[PDB]
Amino acid sequence: ADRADILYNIRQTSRPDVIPTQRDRPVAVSVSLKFINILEVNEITNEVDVVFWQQTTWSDRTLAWNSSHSPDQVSVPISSLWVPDLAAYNAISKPEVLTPQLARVVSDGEVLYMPSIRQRFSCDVSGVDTESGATCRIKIGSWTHHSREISVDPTTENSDDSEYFSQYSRFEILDVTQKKNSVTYSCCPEAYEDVEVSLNFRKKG
Amino acid sequence: ADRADILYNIRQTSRPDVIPTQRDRPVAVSVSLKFINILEVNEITNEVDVVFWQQTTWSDRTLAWNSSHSPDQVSVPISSLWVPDLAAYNAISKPEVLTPQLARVVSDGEVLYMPSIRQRFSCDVSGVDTESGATCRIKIGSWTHHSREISVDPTTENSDDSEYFSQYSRFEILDVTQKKNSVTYSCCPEAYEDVEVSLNFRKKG
Amino acid sequence: ADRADILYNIRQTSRPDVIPTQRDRPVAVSVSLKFINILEVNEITNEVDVVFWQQTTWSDRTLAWNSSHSPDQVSVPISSLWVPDLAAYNAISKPEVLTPQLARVVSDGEVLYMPSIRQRFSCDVSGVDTESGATCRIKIGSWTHHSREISVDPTTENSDDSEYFSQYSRFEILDVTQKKNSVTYSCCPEAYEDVEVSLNFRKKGR
Amino acid sequence: ADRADILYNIRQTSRPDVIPTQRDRPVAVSVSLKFINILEVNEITNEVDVVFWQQTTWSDRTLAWNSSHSPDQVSVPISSLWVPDLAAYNAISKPEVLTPQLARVVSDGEVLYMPSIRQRFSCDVSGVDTESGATCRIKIGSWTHHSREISVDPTTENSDDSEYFSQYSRFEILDVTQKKNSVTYSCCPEAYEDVEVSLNFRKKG
Amino acid sequence: ADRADILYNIRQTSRPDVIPTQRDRPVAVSVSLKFINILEVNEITNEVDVVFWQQTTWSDRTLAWNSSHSPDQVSVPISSLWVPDLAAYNAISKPEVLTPQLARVVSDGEVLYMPSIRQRFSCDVSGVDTESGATCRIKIGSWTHHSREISVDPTTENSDDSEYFSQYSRFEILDVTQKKNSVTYSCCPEAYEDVEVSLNFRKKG
Numbered sequence A, B, D, E: 001a002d003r004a005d006i007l008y009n010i011r012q013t014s015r016p017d018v019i020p021t022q023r024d025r026p027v028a029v030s031v032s033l034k035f036i037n038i039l040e041v042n043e044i045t046n047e048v049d050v051v052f053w054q055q056t057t058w059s060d061r062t063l064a065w066n067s068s069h070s071p072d073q074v075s076v077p078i079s080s081l082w083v084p085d086l087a088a089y090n091a092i093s094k095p096e097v098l099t100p101q102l103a104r105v106v107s108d109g110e111v112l113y114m115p116s117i118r119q120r121f122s123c124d125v126s127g128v129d130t131e132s133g134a135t136c137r138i139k140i141g142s143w144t145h146h147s148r149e150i151s152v153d154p155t156t157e158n159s160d161d162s163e164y165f166s167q168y169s170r171f172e173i174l175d176v177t178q179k180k181n182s183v184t185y186s187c188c189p190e191a192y193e194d195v196e197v198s199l200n201f202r203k204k205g
Numbered sequence C: 001a002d003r004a005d006i007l008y009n010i011r012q013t014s015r016p017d018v019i020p021t022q023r024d025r026p027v028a029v030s031v032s033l034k035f036i037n038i039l040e041v042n043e044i045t046n047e048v049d050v051v052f053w054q055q056t057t058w059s060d061r062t063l064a065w066n067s068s069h070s071p072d073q074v075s076v077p078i079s080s081l082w083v084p085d086l087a088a089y090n091a092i093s094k095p096e097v098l099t100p101q102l103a104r105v106v107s108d109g110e111v112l113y114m115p116s117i118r119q120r121f122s123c124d125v126s127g128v129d130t131e132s133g134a135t136c137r138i139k140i141g142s143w144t145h146h147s148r149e150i151s152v153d154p155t156t157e158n159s160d161d162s163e164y165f166s167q168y169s170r171f172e173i174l175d176v177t178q179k180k181n182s183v184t185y186s187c188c189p190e191a192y193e194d195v196e197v198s199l200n201f202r203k204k205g206r
């Protein structure tokens, strides 16, 4: 009936180390990077320092409860949940998580986990100080799950790419495009999926 | 009763991972910053390194006990308590909490959590070296709770804004204004509340 | 009967999250800083990096045991003990604890917790390169316990201020004075207590 | 059974603090460094800052389950598994793990743990600005397990040395060779095994 | 007995927080530093950054077992063991432990804990760029145990001073001497013991 019951009941069924595959179908994870800031850019070392929302949604039907005469959503610590093992492939620093580590769980089992992350990347910084700008490509996918266990797809909101971008950054955003790739590597027989986020940005003035 | 008994009861009653909303009424959180130091400012990157008390006040009326023949108040570690999931939206560093992580809990269920935090912010540093100074705006609100779960209000009684501000800072405070915002974003149908703190400050002339 | 027994009996009565007051009297905490080093000084930013022992003593009668056929004292991890919530009010960095987090506990329930700490302070560094030197003032008190719950007093045994100060520092100590303040603030009706430690130091000459 | 039963069983029988030896044979560990980036190099101090995958494989046959009808692989938190106590002998910083801390456990008991690590090393940086380049040697072996308890060989995979190395690095990889050593030391009458990775790299242009 | 039974016997017998003294007598601790690297030196501030093995051996005969038809030794995590509360008295940084936190336990009850540590020291750096070099003195002893509870003594042999010292350091070791001291201090009536390590080193030319 209350939010304590809902949580207790999540923990009875929720297995944080068990991927919540429905039948033998992958977990469909939505990924959308929302850039908040570009703090440090190095044209010689080809490194950028960015703040972004790593917006991550998926379904876990074992979390699902009856929202009749109950709250329809709750905030849940991510240690009580299974969370995709997403890694930015071209990161050169540990993710610095700036926000409380809470997921929004809906009563149909939908999970919204939207951390704000500060992280350093190896990417093409050339042309940052030009009209056309530089294009930094950030690849995010699962570390240990191939395409039959986790699929990753870009979702976008219709709103402008820089509606949440700091006006006090030295840089401005020209365009953010998100591409899905499905690649088979030399380690493993199954294909791994990633979202490739192309940040087209340049200095102001 | 005694202090041991009050702490034991809180351990039995307090659900750290469950928002204490009785009858689906929003938890009213009092948020206000008291600035202690300004350590670093960068005119070009528009970044500031500040020390402040993040003064957080609310009621968890499940914690409440009868203090007729018992202490009125106890200091409690915050790990035993629910604490609001507040984030500084324009912070570019994790909060460096400088103080023991204890909240003061009153017999009526009022919780006083007043950590001292060092944190870096992306904000307007323009004019900092002038007599008018810069106005750095810092927004704080819940990360995962809308207005019907967490409301945020500023505690705006008549006090000196520099009362506890270090005389040994290279900077000085002209004014601190605190204002409540209620905004509906595209993500979600419900309004999210935030307190915007406007720090008017300058390099000492 | 042995050290094992004492640590077990401590773990049965000790409540690390419960302040061990006797009657409605405050816990009497002795705080004194012993300066080991001054590492980084900046007169422009008014910031100092210092290494000091934060010598902290108090009574916890919940720890007390009968030491007739038993050892008088044990070393105990501080996680098993209540420890005062002391903060250096003008610190600008979290304390960097250099030493094992063990307290010495005597059978009468006296606790001696003497961590070596490196910490950065916002204080008055003006005059550091003069004969008179700078006077940097450090204020240490409880974060959450008013004067009816924690009293702080300086432990002044009239020692040499430089007794344990590094000869290899670029700085030397001219004097250390430690005084108790009782102040009532706008937040609260009850008085809060602090020890104010005044470190008068200078750059060495030549 | 469902992946929940496989994972519950793995961590049920798994003994993280006990080396899973079979019939007094050493636990055969395979080690391989895949170089992703060189971030900082200092020829004066002879220090390099490297991002690399530490590819570690071994068998714990006590984890084996029948996978005729079941999934034959699962992702498991390393905290639940025994892990070889490997150390980079000439590292001058603790390893910074960038990636989710999950191993891949196969139905026959094989464990694949491939963390992405940022670490600093003491090694020969002389010649980095020349055409021949510098050769930085990284030694990796057990800290407490001799050759009768842990053996360490390089994987037979002599892949492309610069396969996943960033095109956006300042540096380029010329050659990577991996050789095994068996050394006896003054401390100990038993031999200790290590893989020596020789990284021949230089600045581009 | 297998490696698990030996560990479980240690866990039922060893107490991390209880010093394993016999009657009124101290635990005889052997301490020797083995210098691996000297990374940063500053003759103005008298500060050194060094990597060394803190080689710590002692006996706990309560841990002993019959090894005739069982393993002679096991690696054990230090959280299962009492370990000496040793501090480097003139350290100005927290010990950065570079290596897995495992002790070697022998069937006769000897414990060998040999962490590799990077740590900064306040000590005499004067003459480091000369033929005589600097003599940096490091003192190691128990933080909380007097001489009737813990005795410290240097290990019986410095096989060679430069044996495992990095040939890639800007510095070289001329000599290492390790002597024992027993000192009565103003705090306490009981004598404390320490090992004074004198590192005679110079810049290479």
Ligand SMILES: CN1C(=O)[C@]23C[C@H]4C(C)(C)[C@@]5(C[C@@]41CN2CC[C@@]3(C)O)C(=O)Nc1c5ccc2c1OC=CC(C)(C)O2
Pocket: A089, A090, A139, A142, A143, A144, A145, A185, A186, A187, A188, A192, D036, D053, D104, D112, D114, D164
């Ligand atoms: C060597 N690898 C493994 O064994 C697996 C699956 C592999 C992949 C596909 C994620 C892996 C490394 C990975 C990391 N994973 C750990 C266990 C594993 C079997 O799932 C891989 O094999 N190739 C990767 C990988 C990650 C990221 C990547 C890859 O390829 C190229 C460029 C960059 C930008 C570095 O992006």
Ligand SMILES: CN1C(=O)[C@]23C[C@H]4C(C)(C)[C@@]5(C[C@@]41CN2CC[C@@]3(C)O)C(=O)Nc1c5ccc2c1OC=CC(C)(C)O2
Pocket: A036, A053, A055, A104, A112, A114, A164, B089, B090, B139, B142, B143, B144, B145, B185, B186, B187, B188, B192
């Ligand atoms: C995308 N988002 C979510 O899905 C929710 C609620 C959203 C809000 C309202 C807190 C969110 C991001 C948030 C963060 N939250 C995580 C889960 C969530 C549904 O509660 C949001 O949607 N808009 C925000 C937000 C945070 C801060 C913010 C926002 O808007 C504009 C400027 C800045 C200064 C960056 O401040």
Ligand SMILES: CN1C(=O)[C@]23C[C@H]4C(C)(C)[C@@]5(C[C@@]41CN2CC[C@@]3(C)O)C(=O)Nc1c5ccc2c1OC=CC(C)(C)O2
Pocket: B036, B053, B103, B104, B112, B113, B114, B164, C089, C090, C139, C142, C143, C144, C145, C146, C185, C186, C187, C188, C192
């Ligand atoms: C705002 N505050 C509180 O509400 C209480 C008690 C307050 C005090 C008295 C410790 C507090 C902040 C404190 C910290 N505590 C957290 C809960 C509390 C009621 O115990 C305070 O109210 N004033 C303080 C305080 C700390 C330090 C300090 C203070 O005053 C002036 C200057 C400097 C040098 C910064 O030193």
Ligand SMILES: CN1C(=O)[C@]23C[C@H]4C(C)(C)[C@@]5(C[C@@]41CN2CC[C@@]3(C)O)C(=O)Nc1c5ccc2c1OC=CC(C)(C)O2
Pocket: D089, D090, D139, D142, D143, D144, D145, D185, D186, D187, D188, D192, E036, E053, E104, E112, E114, E164
């Ligand atoms: C002194 N040492 C010990 O007592 C053991 C086993 C030893 C070895 C062989 C791993 C040890 C240090 C080690 C570390 N181990 C901890 C317990 C031990 C008995 O397993 C050692 O004895 N020699 C080592 C060692 C580690 C690394 C090393 C060594 O030798 C040469 C060069 C460098 C680059 C420094 O690499």
Ligand SMILES: CN1C(=O)[C@]23C[C@H]4C(C)(C)[C@@]5(C[C@@]41CN2CC[C@@]3(C)O)C(=O)Nc1c5ccc2c1OC=CC(C)(C)O2
Pocket: C036, C053, C104, C112, C114, C164, E089, E090, E139, E142, E143, E144, E145, E146, E185, E186, E187, E188, E192
């Ligand atoms: C003040 N101190 C105590 O009360 C005790 C025992 C003391 C000693 C002897 C370890 C202590 C500090 C110590 C640290 N210990 C914590 C509890 C204690 C009673 O064991 C001490 O009292 N003198 C020390 C000490 C440590 C290191 C040291 C000391 O003296 C001289 C030079 C330097 C280089 C600073 O080295």
Ligand SMILES: *[C@@H]1O[C@H](CO)[C@@H](O)[C@H](O)[C@H]1NC(C)=O
Pocket: A066, A067, A068
């Ligand atoms: C949810 O609860 C309602 C009211 O109690 C009930 O009618 C309905 O059957 C429940 N839903 C499911 C899926 O059982």
Ligand SMILES: *[C@@H]1O[C@H](CO)[C@@H](O)[C@H](O)[C@H]1NC(C)=O
Pocket: B066, B067, B068
């Ligand atoms: C608290 O307890 C006292 C004494 O037991 C009692 O008189 C009083 O009614 C109680 N308070 C309330 C609000 O009921």
Ligand SMILES: *[C@@H]1O[C@H](CO)[C@@H](O)[C@H](O)[C@H]1NC(C)=O
Pocket: C066, C067, C068, C069
């Ligand atoms: C301590 O124990 C002894 C017996 O060993 C006893 O005589 C004495 O009364 C005890 N002390 C106290 C305070 O009870």
Ligand SMILES: *[C@@H]1O[C@H](CO)[C@@H](O)[C@H](O)[C@H]1NC(C)=O
Pocket: D066, D067, D068
């Ligand atoms: C695995 O499972 C099958 C089907 O249950 C069983 O018949 C068989 O004995 C097992 N196979 C092996 C090789 O152990």
Ligand SMILES: *[C@@H]1O[C@H](CO)[C@@H](O)[C@H](O)[C@H]1NC(C)=O
Pocket: E066, E067, E068, E069
């Ligand atoms: C150790 O065990 C063997 C039998 O396995 C036995 O011969 C020997 O006596 C035992 N040692 C001791 C000291 O009891």
